[PDB]
């Protein structure tokens, strides 16, 4: 680890600086270094970790989609053979994406999840595990594709079970988990009806619990509720 000589607190400070500078690869490297110090992460620190890698992998996914689209068109009837370059470069980006996903999954497995006992930490990490298996699933085509999908499903399901037992229905982690598990159903598991049911039930149960919240908690919860509605509108 090239961050092994830097203080944990300095890594966290520099992750925040990297965020301000929109240097998300640096942010992710700093937060990986912080995780590798071996201490549990606070709430703020968990969100720095997730923000960093979500931005990095989000850019990779967008690039992969562009290249996959070009590749599929190069393979339509009538196309002019362009050689191996489009496939090669899509493969390059894909391998880099898989590497980022494997890095995050490795941090969760060594040893963030096993030390996470509070619902807010454990659900957050299991959601991340489902998310990064989902990104692996998006590019998977081989003998392992079904197992990658089931790994995402299993992580999301454990997170869901804990969240329903231990968090209120407006908890933003619970809401974001359900949002993403619903997208997993729609886009990965070929289960649009499950996706729609989950989004609707999550939205309605949250609606009924909003009366318990402060103004600031209300803003946080209704933001994610709007994303659930947005997806439902896309899908119906």
């Amino acid at each position: 680890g090239a961050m092994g000589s830097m203080e944990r607190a300095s890594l966290i400070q520099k992750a925040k600086l990297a965020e301000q500078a929109e240097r998300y690869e640096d942010m992710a490297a700093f937060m990986k270094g912080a995780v590798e110090k071996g201490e549990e992460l606070s709430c703020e620190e968990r969100n720095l970790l997730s923000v960093a890698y979500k931005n990095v992998v989000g850019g990779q996914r967008a690039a992969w989609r562009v290249l996959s689209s070009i590749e599929q068109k190069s393979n339509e009837e009538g196309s002019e053979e362009k050689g191996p370059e489009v496939r090669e470069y899509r493969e390059k980006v894909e391998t880099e994406l898989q590497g980022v996903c494997d890095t995050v999954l490795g941090l969760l497995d060594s040893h963030l999840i096993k030390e996470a006992g509070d619902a807010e930490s454990r659900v957050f990490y299991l959601k991340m595990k489902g998310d990064y298996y989902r990104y692996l699933a998006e590019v998977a085509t081989g003998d392992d594709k079904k197992r990658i999908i089931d790994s995402a499903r299993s992580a999301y399901q454990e997170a869901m079970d804990i969240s329903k037992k231990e968090m209120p229905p407006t908890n933003p982690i619970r809401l974001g988990l359900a949002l993403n598990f619903s997208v997993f159903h729609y886009e990965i598991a070929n289960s649009p009806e499950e996706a729609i049911s989950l989004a609707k039930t999550t939205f309605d149960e949250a609606m009924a619990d909003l009366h318990t919240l402060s103004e600031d908690s209300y803003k946080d919860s209704t933001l994610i509720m709007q994303l659930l509605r947005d997806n439902l509108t896309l899908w119906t």
Binding site: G176, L179, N180, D230, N231, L234
Partner: peptide, 5 residues
């Protein structure tokens, strides 16, 4: 694409 967080 659908929304995720």
């Amino acid at each position: 694409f659908p929304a995720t967080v």
